[PDB]
Structure 1
Amino acid sequence: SEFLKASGSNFYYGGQKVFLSGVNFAWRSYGSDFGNGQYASNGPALKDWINKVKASGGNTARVWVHVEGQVSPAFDSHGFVTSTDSKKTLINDLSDLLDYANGQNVFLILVLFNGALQNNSNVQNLFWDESKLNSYINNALTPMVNALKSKPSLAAWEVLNEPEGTLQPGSDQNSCYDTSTLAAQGAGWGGKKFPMKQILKTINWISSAIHNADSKALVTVGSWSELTQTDSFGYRNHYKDSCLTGAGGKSNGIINFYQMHTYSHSGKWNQNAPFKVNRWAYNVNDKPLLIGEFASVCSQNEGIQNLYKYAYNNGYNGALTWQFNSGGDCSDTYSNQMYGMQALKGQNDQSGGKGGMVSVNINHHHHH
């Protein structure tokens, strides 16, 4: 009945402005958490993680799905998509996890494809071939969105994670496509495959589809750094409406809330990083802005609870600590994550400018 909405600059549940406080699961098994009957293996862990999330007083978990095509989606011999997975179980798994997350009053952000790295030749061609992308939409995505759109706790689909990881930086007259600066900033660290035009086209079309199947659905993109989603500081905001729509005429092919990832390189913030500024200077009040991904290990050592508090105080609509499974570089431990989540526990400060309601009470389905 009531689903998380995005209005103006804020998230809203049941009218009450909400602040997304939680963690990245990102995964239990990289790229094989759902689909091909793999959910039987990872499921218990993920559910338990949702438990920890709620007990620590959080409301959101960010979970990756397709990732690098290891299970999702199913391609044929020609690189066209046939189904969600070979065993056709993906939708059931996701649906299940959504049910549990709801039962524990936790929202989920389903990240479709990875973009930091994408070493799958079929997924890589989804950016270039329109018919293959359409095959993915028709045979995989549209069924997923259609089947899962009646689920609260499904608060947003993220089309692409860090599209700058596999960006091919280059010059272009069109503001949106030009990437002249990003090369020196360290973009394309996963290999320079996709020019900005192709990424914006892809995202355009994915988001378009998701919204065609689900008018309410919140679509987003989670970027490496802030250099990509703000017009201030001489930077550029590529994933706003005009640019996306500019790449592939889908008017509704737009994200509904921006998102920035941030880490300290050498223990030094980027000068204009989310924690050295506030939401407001990024001049993106037309949509909400979430800080998906941050780690109190790759910060300036402000303190984890101090980082959550910073996010809640300086206008940001959410803050997600980086990976709950405690693995990789620049990742907090699940314990310290829990600790930080306890900083905004049971909080509700709807006095504007401040984060808002944290502990949300989510519905079930209406059906019929």
Structure 2
Amino acid sequence: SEFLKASGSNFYYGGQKVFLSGVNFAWRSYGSDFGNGQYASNGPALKDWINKVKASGGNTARVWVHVEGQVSPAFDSHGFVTSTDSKKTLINDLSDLLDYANGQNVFLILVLFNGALQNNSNVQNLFWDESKLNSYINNALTPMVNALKSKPSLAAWEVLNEPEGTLQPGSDQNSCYDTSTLAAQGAGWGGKKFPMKQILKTINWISSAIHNADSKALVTVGSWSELTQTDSFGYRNHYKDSCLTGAGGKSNGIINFYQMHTYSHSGKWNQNAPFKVNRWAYNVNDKPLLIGEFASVCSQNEGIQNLYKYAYNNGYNGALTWQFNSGGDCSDTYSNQMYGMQALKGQNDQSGGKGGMVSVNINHHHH
């Protein structure tokens, strides 16, 4: 069966370039959607939400899993992972959602942990303790990967969301680790916990083990801003192969596609933010680039649909609104998030530089 691949600048499914059009859920219940039998409550709403996506001609949902350790993964008193969740429900809960999504021709991006906020000590120590990280890997992650890797609906795994949130900025000879410009750009807002080195080592080890278990699996990391995923404009791409691989020494611990998130401040984009610019401008054409989050309501009033269209026409490999449950700062309405996806209902253009296939026919699970 066919899965979503990433090759050069593009996503491919079934031989053809594809653009990821859709939304972030990103949860129904924050960190308690899956595990500890919590999916029986949460699942019907997010199945509905996945229905709302196929209906609107969208093809992707980004949805959060461990988050801040609220339910997953399960830790013993010494801070070692015993399992997926104490009721050992997570893998089936995800399995269910992935099977449903498939039926609606929607791809899922599963995001493992939050880095924007990460108020849980046991997770925090995964960044520092090599043995405790391996407990995560061995007792939760590898088993999650092995059960879910035959599921074509699973487009990609995201290790960590907005790592810059809990980043500890500071200098370092090696420029993969130097983040001395970021503090005044506002990183560290979740508290300054981790140096880039630990961040990158942590995500390196984690990717490595996903790839170990599922060779064709797609891994990403969603930065809070353009600032940290391009070498252009005097910025730094902190997540290029060289950097990750040199942090944790695991050679296949890479991301397969980049991902920026983007929001205006007081109605004004950053200078070289994605809707200001080209994907090509980011000089990052080795890998696909996804606009992982954005919202009409923190934009420059271009209007959701022109936003969807801008991303498709200016080289990006997908665009995902924030967020369907409609809650929090800079979140669109689930409704005009649907309006937005309609802007790309028909599309398939294989022309270089234009976006590709949107409505995808996702094959089933085979055994």
TM range (shorter): over 0.9
CA shift at 1:181, angstroms? 0.2
- The one-character-per-residue Cα deviations of 1:331-366 (angstroms, maximum 9, x if unpaired) are 000001000000000211111100000000001x45
- The one-character-per-residue Cα deviations of 1:309-343 (angstroms, maximum 9, x if unpaired) are 00000000000001100000000000010000000
CA shift at 1:153, angstroms? 1.1
Separation in 1 of the partners of 2:79 and 2:67? 16
- The one-character-per-residue Cα deviations of 1:215-252 (angstroms, maximum 9, x if unpaired) are 00000000001000000000000001000000011000
CA shift at 1:132, angstroms? 0.4
- The one-character-per-residue Cα deviations of 1:23-75 (angstroms, maximum 9, x if unpaired) are 00010000000000000000000000000001000000000000000001000
Question: SS where residue 237 of structure 2 aligns?
Answer: coil
Quote the residue 2:158 is aligned against.
Answer: 158
Separation in 2 of the partners of 1:98 and 1:161? 20
Deviates more, 1:344-353 or 1:280-289: 344-353
Question: SS where residue 281 of structure 1 aligns?
Answer: helix
Conserved? CA contact 2:151–2:365, under 8 Å: no
Separation in 2 of the partners of 1:97 and 1:71? 17
Question: SS where residue 254 of structure 1 aligns?
Answer: coil
Separation in 2 of the partners of 1:366 and 1:82? 29
Conserved? CA contact 2:260–2:291, under 8 Å: yes
Separation in 1 of the partners of 2:234 and 2:338? 37
Separation in 2 of the partners of 1:101 and 1:350? 25
Question: SS where residue 158 of structure 2 aligns?
Answer: strand
Separation in 1 of the partners of 2:153 and 2:76? 32
Conserved? CA contact 2:23–2:324, under 8 Å: yes
Separation in 2 of the partners of 1:308 and 1:246? 36
Separation in 1 of the partners of 2:65 and 2:192? 23
Question: SS where residue 275 of structure 1 aligns?
Answer: helix
- The one-character-per-residue Cα deviations of 1:268-295 (angstroms, maximum 9, x if unpaired) are 0001100000100000000000001000
Separation in 2 of the partners of 1:99 and 1:367? 12
Question: SS where residue 139 of structure 2 aligns?
Answer: helix
Separation in 1 of the partners of 2:19 and 2:314? 12
Separation in 1 of the partners of 2:365 and 2:56? 29
Instruction: Give me the TM-score of the superposition, normalised by structure 2.
Output: 0.99
Question: SS where residue 11 of structure 2 aligns?
Answer: strand
Question: SS where residue 293 of structure 1 aligns?
Answer: strand
Conserved? CA contact 2:152–2:365, under 8 Å: no
Question: SS where residue 164 of structure 1 aligns?
Answer: helix
- The one-character-per-residue Cα deviations of 1:89-144 (angstroms, maximum 9, x if unpaired) are 00000000000000000000000000000000000000000000000000000000
Moved over 4 A (4+): none
Conserved? CA contact 2:59–2:359, under 8 Å: yes
- The one-character-per-residue Cα deviations of 1:180-228 (angstroms, maximum 9, x if unpaired) are 1000000000000000000000000000000000000000000001000
What are the within-5 Å matches in structure 2 for residues 272-283 of structure 1?
272-283=272-283
Quote the residue 1:113 is aligned against.
Answer: 113
Question: SS where residue 123 of structure 2 aligns?
Answer: helix
Separation in 1 of the partners of 2:35 and 2:113? 14
Quote the residue 1:246 is aligned against.
Answer: 246
Separation in 1 of the partners of 2:275 and 2:63? 24
- The one-character-per-residue Cα deviations of 1:152-175 (angstroms, maximum 9, x if unpaired) are 110000000000000000000001
Quote the residue 2:357 is aligned against.
Answer: 357
Conserved? CA contact 2:244–2:254, under 8 Å: yes
Conserved? CA contact 2:37–2:89, under 8 Å: yes
Give the fraction of aligned pairs with identical amino acids, expressed as a percent: 100
Question: SS where residue 339 of structure 1 aligns?
Answer: helix
Separation in 2 of the partners of 1:36 and 1:125? 23
Question: SS where residue 261 of structure 1 aligns?
Answer: strand
Conserved? CA contact 2:18–2:357, under 8 Å: yes
Separation in 1 of the partners of 2:111 and 2:301? 28
Question: SS where residue 178 of structure 1 aligns?
Answer: coil
Question: SS where residue 160 of structure 1 aligns?
Answer: strand
CA shift at 1:367, angstroms? 3.9
Separation in 2 of the partners of 1:310 and 1:248? 37
CA shift at 1:264, angstroms? 0.3
Quote the residue 2:260 is aligned against.
Answer: 260
- Greater helix proportion: 2
Quote the residue 1:366 is aligned against.
Answer: 365
- The one-character-per-residue Cα deviations of 1:2-37 (angstroms, maximum 9, x if unpaired) are 000000000000111000000000100000000000
